[PDB]
Amino acid sequence: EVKLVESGGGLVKLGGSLKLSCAASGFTFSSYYMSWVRQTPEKRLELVAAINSNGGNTYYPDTVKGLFTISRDNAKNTLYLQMSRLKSEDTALYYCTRLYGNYVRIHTMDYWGQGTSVTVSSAKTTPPSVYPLAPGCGDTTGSSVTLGCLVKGYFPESVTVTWNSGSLSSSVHTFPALLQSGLYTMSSSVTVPSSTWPSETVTCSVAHPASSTTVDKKLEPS
Amino acid sequence: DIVLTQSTSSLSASLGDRVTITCRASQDIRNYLSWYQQRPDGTVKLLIYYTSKLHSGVPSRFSGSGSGTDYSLTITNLEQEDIATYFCQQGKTLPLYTFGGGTKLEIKRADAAPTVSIFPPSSEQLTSGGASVVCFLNNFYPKDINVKWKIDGSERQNGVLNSWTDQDSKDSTYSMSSTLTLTKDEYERHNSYTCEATHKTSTSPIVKSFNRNE
Numbered sequence: 001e002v003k004l005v006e007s008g009g010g011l012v013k014l015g016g017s018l019k020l021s022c023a024a025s026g027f028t029f030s031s032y033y034m035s036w037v038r039q040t041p042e043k044r045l046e047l048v049a050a051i052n053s054n055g056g057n058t059y060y061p062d063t064v065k066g067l068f069t070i071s072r073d074n075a076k077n078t079l080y081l082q083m084s085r086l087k088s089e090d091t092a093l094y095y096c097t098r099l100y101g102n103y104v105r106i107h108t109m110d111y112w113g114q115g116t117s118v119t120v121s122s123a124k125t126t127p128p129s130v131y132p133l134a135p136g137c138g139d140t141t142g143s144s145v146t147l148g149c150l151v152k153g154y155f156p157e158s159v160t161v162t163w164n165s166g167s168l169s170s171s172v173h174t175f176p177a178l179l180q181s182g183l184y185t186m187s188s189s190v191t192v193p194s195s196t197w198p199s200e201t202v203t204c205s206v207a208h209p210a211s212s213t214t215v216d217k218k219l220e221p222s
Numbered sequence: 223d224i225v226l227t228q229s230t231s232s233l234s235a236s237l238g239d240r241v242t243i244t245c246r247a248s249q250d251i252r253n254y255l256s257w258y259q260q261r262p263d264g265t266v267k268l269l270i271y272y273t274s275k276l277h278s279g280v281p282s283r284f285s286g287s288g289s290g291t292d293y294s295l296t297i298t299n300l301e302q303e304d305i306a307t308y309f310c311q312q313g314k315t316l317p318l319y320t321f322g323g324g325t326k327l328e329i330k331r332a333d334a335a336p337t338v339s340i341f342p343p344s345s346e347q348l349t350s351g352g353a354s355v356v357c358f359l360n361n362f363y364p365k366d367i368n369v370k371w372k373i374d375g376s377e378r379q380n381g382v383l384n385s386w387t388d389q390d391s392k393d394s395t396y397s398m399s400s401t402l403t404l405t406k407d408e409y410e411r412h413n414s415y416t417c418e419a420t421h422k423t424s425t426s427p428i429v430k431s432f433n434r435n436e
């Protein structure tokens with residue numbers, strides 16, 4: 001504290017509505033301007049909306065005016081953003097921020113929350129297909145050996161890959177997801193000593209919380 | 223509608239050196255320019271506001287300067303915590319704030335060649351009618367790499383997905399995964415499968431391969 005914690009994000013259909021919330025602590029909330037900033041998946045930042053201390057004036061850049069409504073509650077230390085007729089393009093990370101100014105002007109954002117993810121899309125929720133990646137044949141067997149797990153055709157984000165190794169150790173590369181034919185594909189790799197596999201069983205477990213699914217796939221040498 | 227341009231998208235530097243990032247406004251913002259640091263996990267902190275004022279708790283090796291339309295952020299004696307993306311923001315008139323597009327700050331290290339692994343499709347994926355060939359290229363430096371796929375002596379980009387990690391916080395290397403997505407029939411059409419890397423660590427292409435007929 002100063003601390004800002006967003007909530008209410010998730011998956012919404014095209015043309016849907018959503019309300020985010022942000023709880024503030026560690027300062028005198030009612031003394032500060034506040035705003036919502038969003039960061040697109042292409043990583044561009046933009047101001048969505050701002051509000052003065054008592055909430056009498058709100059401020060929208062012509063981009064957002066007004067599919068978005070910003071409001072606050074100075075008793076409950078809470079900032080809200082309400083959104084309606086959402087479009088694909090409103091997919092982004094939404095940050096709550098406290099504004100700071102001098103006596104003349106509000107000009108900077110001195111604290112930010114962690115952000116809430118919002119995904120706006122028509123595509124149906126889909127668990128991933130998970131395929132083990134074992135080296136095709138033959139060698140070089142090599143000093144260490146790299147195994148993988150391809151996670152394809154899922155929606156929305158994200159997934160979690162857990163490698164069961166099982167008391168070995170190994171580090172893991174997780175590769176960021178990409179769109180392909182409407183859905184996400186990602187992959188994960190793990191590297192182990194060659195005298196260790198296929199002697200030891202390796203399994204990749206993939207969870208997809210939006211579908212509430214989990215699959216375990218054994219890395220078959222054959 | 224004031225435009226901010228950070229012309230440099232990315233830059234490399236070594237630990238200890240002096241690094242300067244520039245921001246150009248399309249008009250006079252009268253020193254109402256701020257600098258933010260975004261980490262790969264998405265945490266954003268304010269570093270510097272009103273051109274040169276340090277936010278509380280920010281290390282004194284960050285400084286800012288400028289006026290009119292031209293501003294910059296300098297990091298003296300770079301530390302690994304400073305690897306991050308840096309954004310400028312003009313705040314002259316609420317709600318007309320604009321941000322620059324960001325400048326990625328990468329740590330320099332010795333050239334490192336990629337450990338390449340190629341993976342045929344599992345018979346499980348083939349059973350379902352799909353066929354994705356995957357190549358991993360791990361722990362390399364520098365970031366610039368050109369992977370392509372050759373199939374029966376024909377280069378292919380259609381259906382190719384490439385995904386890069388961030389710089390690793392422990393060895394400062396990069397990794398990437400290239401996946402060639404095909405139908406089972408497209409896959410069976412051909413026999414020779416090559417994941418070919420072009421990287422400054424090798425004079426000639428680093429290649430990994432297999433034949434379908436095995």
Ligand SMILES: N[C@H]1[C@@H](OP(=O)(O)O)O[C@H](CO[C@@H]2O[C@H](CO)[C@@H](OP(=O)(O)O)[C@H](O)[C@H]2N)[C@@H](O)[C@@H]1O
Pocket residue numbers: 101102104105252272275
């Ligand atoms: N007329 C005042 C006004 O000029 P203008 O905004 O129209 O360009 O603001 C000037 C800048 O004020 C300084 O703003 C700093 C940023 O907030 C502030 O530092 P702190 O916030 O750390 O306290 C500083 O105290 C302000 N004086 C001002 O010079 C003009 O007088």
